[PDB]
Ligand binder design. Structure first.
Ligand code: HEM
Ligand code: HEM
Ligand SMILES: [Ca+2]
Ligand SMILES: [Ca+2]
Lengths: 357, 357
């Protein structure tokens, strides 16, 4: 039930995609670099307990009566639930703590895209923590407790619950469905495809930023779906939009979900035809997003993409989506990029240790 | 994996509490009574399929290419997941369709309570559907599809995802924890306590409103928790607030969660001491709430209470909570009441049939 926390890479990327998400972007509120480093170490200690299904610190109760408990207690009695906790550093972090010269070139600000309506209050962030688990209360508890530990040093800028995955790093397993009712994750990158991960996802030292070796770069997009209009489109219109049929999820002219697509059989504005690596000079992403619902005017896809360089991953693919037929039914309304550092190597290592030293 | 949809009562009340919730309040946008009745019948048909784990209508695909699919498809491949769908009618519904004289006296508007800060846009509603399931995507899919079918006749006014239950109708089973880290649901009403249900939850014909016989009355409160301040309170302060210890959940002076409380051993402003039936002339509720998180300024408890009469259930208990020590750490920010009709008796019956005729 538990995913190993330590490794050369952070878990929660190549890892099998868990059912639920709680994602939080944080802003830094302290200018004390030593104190922020202390926080990262204590966060890392908490993450080891959390991902093993243990309460933070000395637990949720049984401590001194006059002291606040170490763990807030809402995960008591639940399982590890394949919890992973993945940290990332936004561009804005590098204006602090004398970090300016360490900002990676691969951590490029995104260009404006046609159709954007980005809510600034739900965009950006000095850092992020991605909490993925099969039990949403386990994920929320992890974020909440990290936020508690960080009180006075960081604040939650924005946060997003994903009630169900729309992604896959395990192609042999059942591909999940997004809120448009289509299988989502058929052609991605598998946790077992080490060469493809090395090529498309993990930063290498020779790329230009040594502290980011073994790390990756994350693009988050909050994408609202126009559900009411989509639901009144014909089945054929829906299928034409993607280039795959709805039930089986097979490409046009093929019999099975996993049959390779023949792209020119799709509409010239079909999503898959436009997003496929062949249409983008070989550019390839590890998508790891989740569906959301957030009351009313309000639901969609909290899109997440990992790549070795934002400039050669998300940016050219999204640009090619300018004529996507899907555009009629979606709108990007939030955005953030993060440099996701390499893994916590052992019990003495700590999140951000390669960046801070 | 499936809960029976038909019965003398609607499921989703006395039923074992499922892990997740999607709750939606709807406003009626049509003045055509016959068309609204037609909608209720089609909603009921959908509910039978949904609760059995089947797609609505003729399914999510395989229909005529030029027609919108009958089911939006996002629950394909998932299980019934103990889905229940419970409908209720708000006070405002009775201003329509010539229903004025049928509004139950037990459907009383709530008085103002000290500390209220009710968001009107997230309060009220002509009707509600409570979708409870162990899989949140199953619940969301049910609500979404009901909303789709109702297009042009109803609109979603507000909706609320509950990521984890904070209630219990099964006392022998593990009591879940709320976001304050306490067990929540220890002393409630069990699905097997038929006499207590008859006394405290189900409306009887002699109560004054014949069409509501076998129905119940629902109070919804969206209650924000002041997490940041709570998390800096001592363990003892937290325990004093409730009158039970945090780990075991035992009343003051007792050894086990389910030991009966001795109320006068608790602080005079302790939550349990103030809410207990003995302190309220015997008034007793069936609580069935869920935790929520909704980004930032934002988390708490989406409180749900069922009772035979709002005036003898929620109202006097909440009034007695005026001096609750818990008040320092919570605020009611949304509210609605609904008359929840009796059950769908058989395959030919329909939601609201006793009210509309
Ligand atoms: C709400 C928005 C979106 C929805 C509903 C959606 C849905 C889908 C679906 C159903 C597929 C086909 C199944 C699969 O192979 O995964 C797909 C494929 C894909 N999408 Fe999206 N997508 C969305 C946004 C995006 C965005 C913003 C990007 C990148 C900027 C993107 C990049 C891709 C890529 C690279 C593939 C695989 C194409 C291939 O190699 O065959 N998608 N998407
Ligand atoms: C965020 C708000 C609230 C929280 C965190 C909370 C939490 C709790 C907890 C931990 C218990 C003890 C365990 C149990 O027996 O269930 C309890 C009991 C109870 N609560 Fe609340 N509660 C809240 C709001 C309310 C409200 C608004 C009402 C009614 C107006 C209410 C009525 C009751 C009742 C009737 C009991 C059982 C008392 C007994 O018979 O022993 N609660 N609550
Ligand atoms: Ca077209
Ligand atoms: Ca006191």
């Amino acid at each position: 039930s538990a995913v190993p926390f330590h490794g050369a890479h952070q878990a929660g990327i190549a890892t099998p995609v868990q059912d639920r998400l709680h994602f939080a972007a944080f802003d830094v509120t302290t200018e004390d670099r030593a104190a922020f480093v202390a926080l990262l170490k204590e966060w890392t200690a908490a993450a080891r307990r959390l991902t093993a299904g243990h309460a933070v610190g000395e637990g949720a109760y049984g401590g001194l009566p006059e002291a606040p408990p170490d763990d807030t207690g809402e995960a008591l009695g639940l399982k590890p639930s394949r919890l992973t906790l993945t940290i990332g550093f936004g561009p804005s972090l590098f204006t602090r703590f004398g970090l300016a010269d360490l900002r990676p070139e691969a951590l490029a600000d995104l260009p404006k895209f046609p159709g954007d309506n980005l809510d600034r209050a739900r965009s950006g962030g000095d850092l992020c923590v991605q909490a993925c688990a099969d039990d949403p209360q386990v994920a929320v508890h992890a974020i909440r407790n990290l936020a508690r530990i960080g009180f006075g040093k960081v604040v939650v800028r924005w946060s997003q619950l994903g009630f169900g995955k729309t992604s896959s790093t395990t192609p042999d397993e059942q591909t999940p469905r997004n809120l448009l009712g289509f299988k989502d994750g058929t052609r991605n990158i598998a946790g077992t495809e080490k060469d493809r991960l090395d090529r498309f996802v993990w930063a290498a030292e020779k790329d230009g930023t040594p502290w980011m070796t073994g790390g990756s770069y994350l693009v988050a997009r909050r994408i609202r779906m126009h559900i009411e209009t989509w639901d009144r489109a014909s089945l054929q219109e829906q299928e034409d939009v993607f280039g795959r049929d709805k039930g089986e999820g097979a490409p046009v002219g093929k019999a099975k979900e996993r049959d390779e697509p023949f792209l020119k059989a799709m509409k010239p504005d079909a999503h898959v035809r436009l997003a496929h690596p062949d249409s983008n000079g070989g550019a390839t992403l590890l998508r790891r997003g989740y569906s959301f619902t957030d009351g009313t005017d309000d639901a969609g896809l909290f899109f997440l993409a990992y790549q070795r360089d934002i400039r050669t991953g998300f940016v050219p693919v999204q640009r090619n989506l300018a004529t996507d037929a899907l555009n009629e039914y979606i709108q990007h309304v939030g955005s953030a990029v993060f440099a996701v550092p390499p893994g916590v190597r052992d019990a003495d290592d700590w999140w951000g240790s390669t960046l801070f030293g």
